[PDB]
């Protein structure tokens, strides 16, 4: 199963992925793409042959970085190679607002009627990540 992971902090996301296995390019076959500004434009070069996406956003990040994350998720949502696929949206172990993410990301109106799941996840909460991945795999089975 070929999956793609795109998110802010590309090496940070690849570290979160390495935590599961006990960057800036091609890395359950999860390919983690880099999060640098230049590589975000070239992200779309790798999307082919994917069956699901794992989108990571830094909710604790600054407002502009959150704006970039919202724009990137919106671009991924309407991509023809990714629009028909189910993909899960996941941040840090401990954070100083899923409802805020839904309201500000406008995922209630646009992200409606398709097998998409926005679930909380933390680096110190392994079981929650396992449950989120189990739901994602259950969606992949459809």
């Amino acid at each position: 199963y070929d999956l793609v992971c795109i998110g802010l902090t590309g090496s940070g996301k690849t570290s979160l992925l390495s935590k599961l296995c006990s960057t800036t390019g091609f890395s359950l076959n999860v390919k983690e793409l880099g999060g640098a500004d230049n590589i975000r434009k070239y992200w779309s070069r790798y999307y082919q042959g994917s069956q699901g996406v794992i989108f990571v956003l830094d909710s604790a990040s600054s407002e502009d970085d959150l704006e970039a994350a919202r724009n990137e998720l919106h671009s991924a949502l309407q991509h023809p190679q990714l629009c028909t696929l189910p993909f899960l949206i996941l941040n840090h172990q401990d954070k100083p607002s899923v409802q805020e993410i839904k309201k500000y990301f406008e995922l209630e109106p646009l992200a409606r009627g398709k097998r998409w799941i926005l679930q909380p996840c933390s680096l110190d909460d392994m079981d929650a990540l396992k449950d989120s991945f189990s739901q994602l795999i259950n969606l992949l089975e459809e």
């Binding site: 434009k41 779309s44 790798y46 082919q48 309407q78 023809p80 190679q81 629009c83 028909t84």
Partner: protein, 153 residues
């Protein structure tokens, strides 16, 4: 007889790849990111007849955006709007497909109607291997190939 033409066309389609029917990069009408959508550029764009134009930055093999001709119906040519405004506003998706991809799979990717133009890239290879841009392919090209096979009717 007619079944012979049917089988020949089916064989031609099954053997044919996207690399065969694509337009190579040397023939592709493109435009740089630094361009400005002034009166002269719009004439050059509207005369080529292409409805979707790849927009690159730096090199013709570095494609960063797509330009839609329908987006140029409301623009005025005197304001000299830069291309960056339209590209950053619309931000159309970029389709990338490999050269080895077959007619059926690439054709399936268009079925959703969310896109009509893809960029053919090759797995090139010393030095670290990379993606190499070969050309562009459209839904029109595959449909022209299918009708050119005269299978239907």
């Amino acid at each position: 007889k007619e079944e012979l033409n049917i089988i020949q066309g089916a064989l031609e389609l099954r053997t044919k790849t996207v690399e065969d029917v694509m337009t190579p990069l040397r023939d592709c009408f493109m435009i740089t990111g630094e361009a400005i959508l002034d009166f002269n550029t719009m004439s050059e764009i509207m005369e080529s007849g292409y409805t979707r134009i790849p927009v690159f930055e730096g090199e013709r093999s570095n494609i960063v955006d797509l330009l839609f001709v329908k987006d140029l119906a409301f623009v005025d040519p005197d304001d000299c709007t830069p291309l960056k405004t339209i590209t950053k506003f619309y931000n159309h998706p970029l389709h990338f497909v490999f050269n080895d991809t077959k007619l059926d799979a690439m054709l399936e990717e268009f079925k959703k109607g969310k896109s009509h133009l893809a960029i053919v890239q090759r797995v090139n290879n010393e030095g670290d291997p990379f993606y190499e841009v070969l050309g562009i392919v459209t839904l029109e090209d595959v449909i022209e190939e299918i009708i050119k096979s005269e299978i239907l009717d």
